[PDB]
């Protein structure tokens, strides 16, 4: 689809079996999801936003699925202020910006 | 244009009479720029983000050129670690995610 930019390019997504809602961000390099739970191993990461750093928790080649379109790849979780889908997700579902 | 995201989409703008590179930000509700002293008058104002908040000043009406697309709006002026061009003007130069 084409998504305008006159509200927050919000989308549901469907990780570890449930159902959230996540704004499609190309400002992160990164995606970073609110706390939950997710299964599998994971490592502890810091990493720094407008404000500064924050410790997550990293789970590598979880499968994703925004807006119907299937990702795999790198997730973040921890005390973000929004579920955000960064620019390594974007790129899996061929997500551009055009003007 | 069409903006892949394998990079970072940074692009060229042009403020208060100085070019700057700035990040185009689906993610950003608004315009967070670097330091700098812009005349007029202005209200101070938080914002904040993953690490929490920032000071930062409201300015109004201020004329940016975004990729030779010309917007007007509100930038907020502050020790933003990066240049964040949001919604408010991306809308201005027609800007659409795109999968
Ligand atoms: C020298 C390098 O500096 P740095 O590493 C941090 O640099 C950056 C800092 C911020 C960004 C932009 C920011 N992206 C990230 O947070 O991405 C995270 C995750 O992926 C990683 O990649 C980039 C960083 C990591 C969002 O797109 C936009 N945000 C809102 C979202 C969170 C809802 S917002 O900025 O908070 C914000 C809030 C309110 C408003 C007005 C009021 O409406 C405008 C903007 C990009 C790079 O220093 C660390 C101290």
Redesign the interface.
Known sequence: ??????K??LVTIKIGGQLKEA???????DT?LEEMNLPGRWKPKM????????KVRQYDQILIEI?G?KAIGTVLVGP???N?IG?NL??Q???????
């Open positions: 689809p084409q998504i305008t930019l006159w927050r390019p704004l499609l961000d190309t400002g992160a390099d970073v990493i720094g936003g407008i404000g500064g750093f924050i807006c379109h973000t202020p929004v955000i620019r974007l790129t579902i061929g997500c551009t910006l055009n003007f």
